[PDB]
Design a protein around this nucleic acid. Structure first.
Lengths: 272, 94, 94, 263, 266, 267
DNA sequence: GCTACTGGGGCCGAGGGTGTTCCTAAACCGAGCAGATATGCTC
DNA sequence: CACTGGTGGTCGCCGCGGTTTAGGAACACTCTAAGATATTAGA
DNA sequence: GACCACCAGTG
DNA sequence: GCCCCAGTAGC
């Protein structure tokens, strides 16, 4: 009997696995602990499986995950994306040709960028502005949004540091990195499953996941970052688990998985 | 999107792994999930094509009088019976 | 009024009859029905009061991310585990 | 453990049992037939259990059905109600005393009768009419309504005594659920306002208010089709009508709305 | 005008309630012979028997041994509406309520109630004399009395004498409720006790509560047996069987209600 | 673009290098910059450290069958380098560059250049005629009964032995070809002769070498008629791909086929 | 009936002209009566 | 771990101040070269 | 006469 | 080295 992926909307957002060997037993995705504890993972019902340090996946496991269309994301400290195994040739020709068509033309590229701006900030972008100029405007808006959310939730805020070598009682930046990493995960899974290219970006460019960063940044501050600030004020013992749990709840309530693809189609609808 | 329960008996490991792909096996041969109509009927196709010797019962949540409905594959001592529309289970003797 | 499934194991017959009072037993120790939250809390009261040696697992439909939740009483090789909020089941060795 | 009843709106409408002994096994309500087939019955999750001829109920089964608030109803020919057993002290003193208080005062009794008339028929009751006069008006309109549906569904009608079989079966089901609800709320089934004397007068009032809405015409349909198994089709249609109309969930507000006319 | 059946099948033979026990002894019961059939444990009733009892109006009541408990009853809520409206008429009118309460007092104690007392005042005198009666039973039977202490949650974590008293009162509420049902009245419509679904049972039972029922609880309390609740239940069963308290409670009920000076039904 | 195949062992990291420990203990130490692409054959288990190292130096991981017979999974899913995907995409969207690339495919497949005044669908026709004649020729030459190409996709067992062999051969060829397209960094869905489907480019490049070795081997296995013909054809394509170095040679063929657009390569 | 264990065998379930269109606890309050650096019992 | 057979023991799991308030498949299409010079087997 | 606890024996 | 299957005990 054939084995096909189920629609992404009907799935759990994310699962994090650590310190165990991932096997396939009787056609099942199984996480075996060093003590012998077997833990079945409903791979077909999850959109992303994050693999933390300590995991040793098998060839059959990677094949099975790719067969039921479940993205594998190898993950580093604070949930940051390190690698990703996915469905080879899982992109639709019409979708990818439309995206690349928009990226090749400079005018259509600026159209898509302006659409991303209007959808991110609600208000249209200033007219007669280039991509670098909208990039600087977007940068200042992001900076002031970080500072403003910081003053709202009452969190000590200085920089928005990405490099983990700067966090030596800095939990807010860790929470932002973990939350945005979850969002990047589900957004990459949505882009691959929808048939688009994560590397073909419009605002971000040259990065291997530029389109993921664009689409995810459009809806990042709507729900995902403010939750990271809420977790940040309430100083936790395990920030990773709190941020993951909160991001999961946010994804269920805001229906992010179901709204990702139509958001992509709305973004690329700039050029007719 | 409704709740789903699959109880298997004497099925080969292929069907048990296939069910472990989507559903949560909370006891030996007892799988629980929450799927759509399409995914439910697909899972049932897996059950039909993969059991071949054992008995399976699938119960999913509905909006009927009992709040749920169920169907069976194979033969079991416990057999559904129809009482004026209400489906119950009878325990047949040897 | 959500869907309910109670899977019992090594449970004395009092709890099996009591569960049969409200829920349809479609396989040995596997009961299914459609009850409200109050009735579910009462059935769990019965489970906790009458098992005393065996293990019981109860699952019911909800509006969480997995669409259902479950709870356990007693010890079983299949033990629930927490994965950053999402509860699954793991099989302990001998 | 206490083993307290379940609210009535949460359970199934009705179950019919036939030709087997009813036992209690490990606390469960079991039906055994002549061949040995044991069949558990969710006694706590059904409003009332109908016992047909051939059943042999045990003591522990009557006690068990009583403890879970599930009315037992012995029925005989064509499902007509013969007898019933329920909780011995399952009457709420405030509801019972309010009902009886309405029944003793002639004025409040007239108010309740006029409320039942205005609820059964869309138009209000004729003013300055006594209780017996309204009873006769409702009776004549009941005869003309039976004959009216008889002409609509095209079945020969000589009076209310196949058609009497279907009507008796469906209306008998409605009397079953209505009696179960009346006993569950705590009111008395014998204390009636339109109907008096018989031990189920209040059931006849409350159920007769709404039987011609959907219950009787469906029995006229089954009576015109006239299949080889009329009782089963009547029971099926009764369960679908009770589920669709959610009769069980809106029976109590009908009783309280009727008795609310006493101010 | 009633009979207890146990340990047999209740069937119909030639229009009579036949009871077939384990030894084959058939008990043929003509329809006009009994108005109520008290069904004890071990009985299985047939559909024809219930049909006969229905077509002649016989009241079936599923009870425990000697009416210690009342598990169910036919015609639930009440078959005769005239008796129910009678009791309710007696209970809603404050004057008839005080008459019935005064009759309860004059039947419970030998002396009539103090004149021109309200229902709550007679309730206070009743409670005080109940306190003194608890003390008197304690001293007579020589048991240490600390009060009417009982935790509704933990039955085992309670005083032994309060366990015995509680079991005795439960059996008494059994036979009493059975008597009220056989007479045809509502157990909830009460005069001294009101509000709860067995108030009338509490009143009628309270009339005779401290006559060999509670004193038997203190008697079993002296011995301190291994299972005092069972010993009290069985002792109450034997007392109900010998003293015929169930049969004798119906005239008491009819008189207590008859003190309302309102025409009773027939 | 270098690559290495690994099977039957654990892939871990030792001293910043990809070590592979096989069933018997043979440790294969692999310098981090020694290989651009690792083909993971059945029987391999990857540790998190290995994925981290390959990630931080940009090494492409591909989970394949034996010798690239199937492509199960691949790292950098969808494509890591946007420049190559936009290069292939620009070649495909412009009809002139499309016809140049198609003409290069034709000339590389047969040896003779296609006729000058020809469109894309016309070259599709010439291709169809020549592969029909090739089917007839191979059938007559190996002496297997030929009644056409068609089959029933709803049931594999309801088909000829020759159609089963041909289908299995083209399947493995699509495996190695797809692996090549992924190792070169291009999109398997962006095709020139084939269009619309998610593996159009795989069919395009696969058609160049399809009737050189794998289909002749399919007619050889069909003539020998073994018990399990699909397994024999698949293992035969496995041996051919290993001995002929089909995967390694396919990549420069891709770079040339795309280079025929006369447009600056990404590099 | 499910679970574990151990040899033996295989690395495996495919095929590709393209694009459109349609199918319910607690708080508050009555009494008496013993007996009182008052509340406590009892209804 | 579930089902069943026989024997000995029970007849049960209670307690009562009263009232108010807190997306596939179907079809519709290109094109070619051989050759039934129409129609067809291939992409 | 109805029901339950117990204590194994088997698949 | 990873995984399925068949058969055979064991509870």
């Amino acid at each position: 009997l054939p084995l096909n992926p189920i629609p992404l909307k009907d799935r759990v957002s994310m699962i994090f696995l650590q310190y165990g060997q991932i096997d396939v037993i009787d056609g099942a995705f199984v996480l075996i602990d060093k003590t012998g504890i077997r833990t079945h993972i409903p791979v077909g019902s999850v959109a992303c499986i994050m693999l933390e340090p300590g995991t040793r996946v098998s060839h059959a496991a990677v094949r099975l995950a790719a067969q039921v269309g479940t993205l594998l994301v190898w993950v580093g400290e604070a949930g940051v994306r390190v690698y990703a195994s996915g469905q080879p040739g899982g992109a639709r020709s019409d979708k990818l040709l439309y995206q690349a068509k928009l990226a090749l033309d400079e005018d259509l590229r600026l159209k898509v960028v302006r659409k991303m701006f209007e959808l991110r900030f609600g208000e249209p972008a200033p007219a007669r502005r280039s991509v670098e100029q909208l990039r600087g405007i977007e940068g200042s808006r992001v900076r002031a949004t970080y500072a403003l959310l910081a003053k709202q939730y009452g969190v000590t805020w200085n920089g928005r540091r990405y490099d983990p070598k700067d966090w030596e009682g800095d939990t807010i930046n860790q929470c932002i990195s973990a939350a945005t990493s979850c969002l990047y995960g589900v957004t990459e899974a949505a882009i691959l499953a929808a048939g688009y290219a994560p590397a073909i970006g419009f605002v971000h460019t040259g990065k291997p996941l530029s389109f993921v960063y664009d689409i995810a940044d459009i809806i990042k501050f709507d729900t995902v970052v403010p939750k990271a600030f809420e977790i940040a004020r309430r100083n936790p013992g395990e920030p990773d688990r709190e941020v993951r749990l909160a991001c999961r709840d946010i994804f269920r309530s805001s229906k992010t998985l179901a709204k990702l693809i139509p958001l992509i189609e709305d973004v690329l609808a700039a050029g007719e | 999107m409704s709740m789903l329960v699959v109880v298997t008996e004497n099925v080969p490991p292929r069907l048990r792994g296939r069910l472990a792909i989507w559903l949560l096996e909370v006891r030996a041969g007892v799988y629980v999930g929450d799927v759509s109509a399409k995914i439910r009927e697909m899972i049932w196709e897996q059950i039909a094509g993969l059991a071949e010797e054992g008995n399976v019962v699938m119960a999913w949540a509905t909006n009927t009088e009992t709040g749920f409905e169920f169907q069976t594959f194979g033969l079991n001592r416990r057999t559904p019976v129809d009482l004026d529309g209400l489906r119950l289970v009878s325990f047949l003797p040897v």
